[PDB]
C-alpha cells in the first residue's frame, strides 16, 4: 500500500561535494526509513536508519533528516568510495517497499558516443541468422536512446541493448545494441541504420550500411 | 563475524521452480526479520518478502503474493525463498537479509538465478568489421559477437591481451534462453587492417577456446 518515491534516479557528482538523495512515502511513514547504498557487484550495507540514525562504520559525512512523507539523504564530502546507488526502503507496513534507487556518479564533461555499425559477418549469415551491431562508445552522461531502422522502417523487435558501467579511467559509459534479424529478412532489405540521440547533439547520429551496396 | 551465506548461483527452466537457501552465521535469524530481495539486471530492488522466523510470520508484496514463498527452519538457522513457475522476469540476483528496524542489518552475497532451457553451448564467434565512415578517421573500432551461448561467462581478449587498452567488452545479455555479448576494440587506424588484430574468447563452460582475426568484410 506504501511505495517510496526516490529522487534523482541519477545523481552526478564529486569528490568534496556534497548531495541529498530523496524519498517520498505514498503516505506517512513515521521515520521508519531506511537508506541503503549499494556499490558495484556488492550486497547492500545500511548507512541509516530510523531515518537519521547512522549505522555502524557509517562515517559522519552522512547525514539523514526527514519527517512523515518526505525523507533525504545528504553525504556531505563525497569521498570517491561512496559511488553507488542508493535505495531507501520503508518498513513502516507490508509491504517494506524500496525507493527506485539513485546512482550517484563521477561528474565529467559531456562527450558524444563514438557510434559505429557493423554489417552481419559471412559466417553469420551461412546460419541464416543475420544481426547488426551497433557500438556507441565512450559517452556522457548516459541517457541515450538508440533506434534501428531497415528501409526507415523502425524495428523495435530483435534489439538486444547493453551497457557497460561508468569506466574507472575516464568515467564515460559505453553501450552495444544489436538487432537480430533471420537471413530471409535481411537479404530482403537494404539498408539498415543505427540512429542514437544523446544529449551532446539536438540530432541523432546516424550510422547506415547499405546491404548490397558494398 | 555474522555471515548469511547465499547458495551458489542457480539455473533452471522456465515453468520449473526453485528454492534458494539462504544461512545466517554470527547470528541466531530469529533475533530478527529474514528477507528475500530481487534485483533483475540493471534494475532496482523489489522486497519480495520476509518471514519472521520466530513466529513462521511471512508478508509479501503483493505481485509475489503467488510467485513466491519464503520459509525458515531455525534449526539450521536458513531462511528460503521459493519461486514456483519461472518466467524469463525471475531470472535476477536474489539476496536475503537478516535485518529489522535498528542497526542490526546484514545481507547475502546475493544468488543469481537465471531462467533458461538452454544447455551448455558454445558461443558462436563472430568478427565485427565496419562500417567504413571510421576509416577516414583516427581510430577504427573493430568488434566481436559472442552469441548464442551458455552459461556464462566468457573473457574476451585481443590479440590474446596485447590489446590490452580500448576495449569494451560489453555485459551479457540473456535473449531468448541464450547468452550474446559483444566486445569493441579501438586501434588506430594505422594497425587494422595493416596488422592484424584477432578476438580471442574462451569459454570455459563448453571448453571452446576460439580465435576471430577481423578480415575487413567485402567493402
Known amino acids: 500500500d506504501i511505495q517510496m518515491t526516490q529522487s534523482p534516479a541519477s545523481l552526478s557528482a564529486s569528490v568534496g561535494e556534497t548531495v541529498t538523495i530523496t524519498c517520498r512515502a505514498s503516505?506517512?511513514?513515521?521515520?521508519?526509513l531506511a537508506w541503503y547504498q549499494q556499490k558495484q557487484g556488492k550486497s547492500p550495507q545500511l548507512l541509516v536508519y530510523?531515518?537519521?540514525t547512522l549505522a555502524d562504520g557509517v562515517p559522519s559525512r552522512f547525514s539523514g533528516s526527514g519527517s512523515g512523507t518526505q525523507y533525504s539523504l545528504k553525504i556531505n564530502s563525497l569521498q570517491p568510495e561512496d559511488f553507488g546507488s542508493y535505495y531507501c526502503?520503508?518498513?513502516?507496513?507490508?509491504?517494506?517497499?524500496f525507493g527506485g534507487g539513485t546512482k550517484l556518479e563521477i561528474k565529467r564533461a559531456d562527450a558524444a558516443p563514438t557510434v559505429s555499425i557493423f554489417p552481419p559477418s559471412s559466417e553469420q549469415l551461412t546460419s541464416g541468422g543475420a544481426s547488426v551491431v551497433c557500438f556507441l562508445n565512450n559517452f556522457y552522461p548516459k541517457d541515450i536512446n538508440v533506434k534501428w531502422k531497415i528501409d526507415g522502417s523502425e524495428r523495435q523487435n530483435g534489439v538486444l541493448n547493453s551497457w557497460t558501467d561508468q569506466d574507472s579511467k575516464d568515467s564515460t559509459y559505453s553501450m552495444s545494441s544489436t538487432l537480430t534479424l533471420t537471413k530471409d529478412e535481411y537479404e530482403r532489405h537494404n539498408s539498415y541504420t543505427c540512429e542514437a540521440t544523446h544529449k551532446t547533439s539536438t540530432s541523432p547520429i546516424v550510422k547506415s550500411f547499405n546491404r548490397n551496396e558494398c | 563475524e555474522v555471515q548469511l551465506q547465499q547458495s551458489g548461483a542457480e539455473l533452471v527452466k522456465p515453468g520449473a521452480s526453485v528454492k534458494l537457501s539462504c544461512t545466517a552465521s554470527?547470528?541466531?535469524?530469529?533475533?530478527?526479520?529474514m528477507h528475500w530481495v530481487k534485483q533483475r539486471p540493471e534494475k532496482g530492488l523489489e522486497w519480495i518478502g520476509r518471514?519472521?522466523?520466530?513466529?513462521?510470520?511471512?508478508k509479501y508484496d503483493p505481485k509475489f503474493q503467488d510467485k513466491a514463498t519464503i520459509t525458515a527452519d531455525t534449526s539450521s538457522n536458513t531462511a528460503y525463498l521459493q519461486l514456483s513457475s519461472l518466467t524469463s522476469e525471475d531470472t535476477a540476483v536474489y539476496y536475503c537479509?537478516?535485518?529489522?528496524?535498528?542497526?542490526?542489518?546484514?545481507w547475502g552475497q546475493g544468488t543469481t538465478l537465471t531462467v533458461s532451457s538452454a544447455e551448455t553451448t558454445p558461443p558462436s564467434v563472430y568478427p565485427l568489421a565496419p562500417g567504413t565512415a571510421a576509416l577516414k578517421s583516427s581510430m577504427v573500432t573493430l568488434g566481436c559477437l559472442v552469441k548464442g551461448y551458455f552459461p556464462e561467462p566468457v573473457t574476451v581478449t585481443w590479440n590474446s591481451g596485447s590489446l590490452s587498452s580500448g576495449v569494451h567488452t560489453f555485459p551479457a545479455v540473456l535473449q531468448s534462453d541464450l547468452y550474446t555479448l559483444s566486445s569493441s576494440v579501438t586501434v588506430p587506424s594505422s594497425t587494422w587492417p595493416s596488422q592484424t588484430v584477432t578476438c580471442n574468447v574462451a569459454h570455459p563452460a563448453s571448453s571452446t577456446k576460439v580465435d576471430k582475426k577481423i578480415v575487413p568484410r567485402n567493402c
Open positions: 537479509a537478516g535485518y529489522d528496524y535498528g542497526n542490526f542489518d546484514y
Open positions: 554470527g547470528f541466531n535469524i530469529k533475533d530478527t526479520y
Open positions: 518471514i519472521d522466523p520466530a513466529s513462521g510470520n511471512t
Open positions: 503516505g506517512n511513514i513515521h521515520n521508519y
Open positions: 530510523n531515518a537519521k
Open positions: 526502503q520503508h518498513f513502516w507496513s507490508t509491504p517494506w517497499t
